[PDB]
Design a binder for this molecule. Sequence first.
Ligand SMILES: [Cl-]
Length: 130
Amino acid sequence: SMQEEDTFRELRIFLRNVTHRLAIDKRFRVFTKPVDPDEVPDYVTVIKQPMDLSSVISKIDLHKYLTVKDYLRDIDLICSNALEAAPDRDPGDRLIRHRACALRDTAYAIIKEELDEDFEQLCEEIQESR
Ligand SMILES: [Cl-]
């Protein structure tokens, strides 16, 4: 229905807002774009499912997220990919992991504070009905 399409529209607007807020945070700059094949060629081999905040925006616009849970799966993937790609004790890797963890925590905290759980439940029930 149009009411359901309106709901999905509201979700995309909200998701777009949260993602923007993430993407402008200077700590999260390394997560804003795909990793560069030239800068390191082993990334595409070691990371099977690359994800970044620009790809998240593209997916919102392609109507790929019908629930907040589906969006958070991609935020989690950005984080888990970073942890896997930067696992060592050296300061460079620890900085990346710290920032990855902060990205995840920030997204979750924004969502906890700003998303009505009944809105999410509605999204889930429309998704399940299709
Ligand atoms: Cl830096």
